[PDB]
Design a binder for this molecule. Structure first.
Ligand SMILES: N[C@@H](CC(=O)O)C(=O)O
Ligand SMILES: N[C@@H](CC(=O)O)C(=O)O
Lengths: 544, 545
């Protein structure tokens, strides 16, 4: 009855990580309410369970996990940002700026009209524009600005409760407004329109064949038996290479009654080469003929690539596609990693002539990741004072920038790693929920009193500030400027900085147009994050 | 100069995560010193950087990350534990018990002889026998036991420093002793001996072909043109199934001049089927013919599996191997087990609907399960009992390891939850322990120089002897008297001692072929060692108090 409170206060790990299971269950619960969402479910469960005791909030854990989340988001968005900036015009930047200006004006007007205190204003902003990074900067600015200590403590205490109150709407709505209402008003279907636009533009992924080795076995009949590999290779068209007899790299050899040929190349070419000059196919069993990806070191050597086919090694791109002869004339001063296949040690000989091996594709140099996080934390402290306002970049924004720059600084020097794609997902699906659960648990004891005292006056203001700017930008961009349909959704979801909408829309659209949607949304994210984070302290200073 | 201290104190994230990069760099550094190790490098860098200020230690972060590490280790070791218990005899348990008894006796004798205080004893145990979950239980027992408050605080303060002092040896040595010295003394080569033993036993992995679909194209000549698929399939031997013409499941059809056949099955069978009745090969381009893995729901239906081949869908195991006809008779009696279906786009779904629903996506993790596991482990930790006035509790890390083991074992028998990625446990168990160690080293750095000046050589040598001698004793007793197999000696004494760095290094050296065998040889000892070595701290505190 009452000892449960003591137990919960005494086992913080149990409390936090039981706030994370029921939350996900509730979020996945579907009762015709268009689901709820994992974050909202976690918040609700944390609020409900916080009533059984008093749990203080730990800053370091939340900061670390939020930093992980921001870094993962930045790394995921990195590669598409450059492509979108290259192809898409400045329309995305224009839409983001329009949205931010509209939100600023609307928030200022509403707060001035309703005579809202600076703390309530900051909380409503952070909980309506769904930007959790505000809280830290707002608290720092409150501490810095000179006012009475009672006011300082009151403002510091009043933020999280209104933040929690407004977040529920800021996430449950807006998502529906720009996922169903906007398509209904625009009389288009997400799938069809996105596919059409992607086909019109050059963004649809192009599947590529992967060249490999097939261990054929020679027939026991009579067809060019007892012959060297060099003449056979010369007879073969381009894109086919022999790989010895059993495991040997000797180029003279002697074909006997029974032995594998171990052809290498594409698929259609080997199909033709087996239809003509018939040969049997077998699974084969040998550890040789391993493939590798190797960077170059000898200043785009030409003759080595020219004679690799004679040597018995096939050269292909990183994706594993037979390269064109012209590619051998020049690559890209120095060159990049290429894929070699044939033989066991001949491939290594060609590699030694060329540069060293490439990233294993599944090993992560933890030094790089840890240094990135630490450098982001350090960069956060950098800041400047404008009109007595100590504005700083913050932590989450710095981590996002570091992720973007680090991702862009890859595949140009493919010598570090390829972080697994099954880790960023966990990071960006766990860190934010953990931070939200911590905040909700902390700001739960006084939630009922806060809602009783400050009631309807707050929720409606939060809803209007969350919704109206989206409608304004939608009308201005659709009826006046008349941009393409899907790009409107692509923006207004990065400027608003909400990831649930991003994930849901990507899943609905599908793989075909998923890269296109990612490109349409990437450029807005960084600008929105920076400006929306800076918009908190400015409001505090103005309304103080 | 001095503002750096203020900056470091004011940016804990920067401090901790700069203690994690230079540490890994140092660990990878090789100057002929047999490397150093990531954990030791992190500890050294943390000790060096802690001198510039005063940083208190946060318990919750360390507890969470250590729990993640323990859970990952348990999940990784789960599947092999049952297999080793099934095949390997109780020799592993006997060796672990011998090691634990020897370590207990040696530690007790040394401490009694040298008149060492309970706090120093607990710290030396923890920094020797490398179990790091001791500290929490030891602190809890110190708080519980009734003594003067000054003694309580002194004992609480004195643990981490000696722990850090002894951990360096406990990790750098022992590893070398049982990775190079023991093979040299036993006159065997790790690779050759492990391969020989694995070949003798039934543990070497067996590669399995993966059946799939090939989109052949019919020749424009004259060979059985204009024929139905049913007669073609009946003519074809077992293991080959047609998949329509372009995307259709109609079984009457009409073969025209140009259209793909879309055969499905193994590789050798299709090779034979293309040498006889020659057909061209093309890459093809279609989204149909997708493969799926589906659990069963209709109580091991027989006729459906019998007629699936006629329907045009090939049934295979989870690994993707054509099943034997006899397998269709019984299967496995309850409605369970998932099988792989390949042919066609919607016919596969029809067969699935006749059978049970789909299986785990193999790349999506129900975070609810993981979070509930962690929370349940934390709760289970609190459970404990008092023996002779000693409140012994299972602790947190041990509970997490047990939960990981049980959860892993409770999978593939009900393959309806997930298959956690294998690129996440590695990160967990390579980051959590190092983060915890960095935090502890940063906290216990200000007074390290004074502690070494006051309590000096008397501690390091005792730690080294307690870390080394039990291994030698068990080695001799098991090799010269009992005469067990060579590699199993290394397999034990590294789980009872709980030395994950040695585990990983030996696995890498041995290679993939005998890696499962080594994992089996080491798994059963880990749990017993963890539990008993964790309980051995409070007992020592009570005895020597
Ligand atoms: N930046 C966060 C916003 C928040 O969680 O407050 C997001 O994208 O979801
Ligand atoms: N159980 C841990 C002990 C430690 O190193 O802290 C291990 O095997 O590594």
């Amino acid at each position: 009855m009452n000892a449960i409170g003591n137990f919960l206060v005494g086992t913080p790990v149990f409390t936090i990580f039981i706030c994370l299971a029921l939350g996900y269950l509730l979020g996945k619960l579907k009762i015709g309410s268009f689901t709820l969402g994992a974050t909202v479910g976690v918040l609700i469960v944390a609020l409900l369970i916080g009533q059984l005791g008093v749990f203080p909030r730990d800053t370091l854990l939340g900061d670390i996990f939020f930093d992980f989340f921001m870094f993962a988001i930045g790394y995921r968005v990195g590669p598409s940002f450059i492509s979108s900036m290259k192809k898409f015009g400045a329309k995305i930047v224009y839409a983001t700026l329009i949205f931010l200006v509209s939100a600023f004006i609307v928030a200022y007007a509403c707060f001035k009209m309703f005579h809202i205190g600076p703390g309530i204003a900051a909380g409503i902003i952070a909980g309506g524009l769904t930007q959790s990074a505000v809280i830290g900067s707002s608290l720092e600015t409150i501490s810095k600005l000179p006012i009475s200590d009672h006011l300082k403590t009151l403002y510091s205490n009043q933020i999280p409760i209104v933040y929690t109150l407004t977040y529920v709407f800021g996430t449950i709505g807006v998502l529906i407004f720009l996922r169903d209402i906007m398509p209904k008003l625009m009389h288009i279907d997400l799938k069809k329109q996105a596919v059409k636009t992607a086909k019109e533009l050059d963004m649809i992924p192009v599947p590529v064949i992967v060249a490999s080795t097939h261990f054929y076995t020679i027939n026991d009949g009579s067809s060019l038996i007892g012959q060297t590999l060099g003449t056979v290779n010369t007879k073969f068209a381009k894109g086919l290479v022999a790989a010895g007899l059993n495991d040997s790299a000797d180029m003279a050899s002697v074909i006997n009654a029974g032995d594998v040929l171990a052809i290498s190349g594409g698929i259609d070419e080997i199909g033709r080469a087996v239809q003509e000059f018939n040969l049997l196919e077998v699974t084969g069993k040998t550890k040789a003929y391993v493939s590798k990806q190797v960077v170059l070191k000898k200043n785009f050597s030409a003759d080595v690539l020219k004679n690799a086919q004679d040597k018995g090694v096939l050269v292909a791109t990183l994706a594993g596609d037979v390269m064109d002869p012209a590619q051998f004339s020049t690559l890209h001063k120095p060159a990049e990693s290429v894929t070699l296949v044939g033989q066991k040690d001949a491939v290594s000989e060609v590699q030694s002539q060329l540069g060293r091996l490439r990233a294993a594709e599944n090993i992560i140099n933890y030094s790089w990741f840890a240094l990135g996080i630490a450098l982001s934390a350090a960069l956060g402290i950098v800041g400047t004072k404008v009109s007595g306002v100590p504005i700083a970049l913050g932590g989450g924004t710095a981590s996002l920038i570091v992720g973007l720059v680090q991702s862009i600084y890859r595949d140009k020097h493919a010598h570090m790693d390829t972080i697994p794609d099954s880790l960023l997902e966990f990071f960006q699906s766990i860190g934010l929920n953990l931070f939200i659960a911590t905040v909700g648990l902390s700001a739960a004891k006084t939630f009922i009193s806060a809602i009783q005292s400050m009631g309807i006056s707050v929720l409606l203001i939060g809803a209007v500030i969350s919704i109206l700017p989206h409608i304004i930008t939608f009308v201005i961009c659709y009826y006046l400027m008349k941009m393409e349909p899907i790009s409107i959704i692509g923006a207004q979801t990065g400027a608003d900085t909400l990831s649930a909408a991003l994930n849901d829309v990507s899943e609905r659209v599908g793989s075909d147009a998923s890269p296109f949607f990612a490109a349409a949304v990437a450029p807005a994210y960084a600008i929105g994050n920076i400006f929306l984070t800076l918009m908190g302290p400015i409001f505090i200073v103005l309304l103080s």
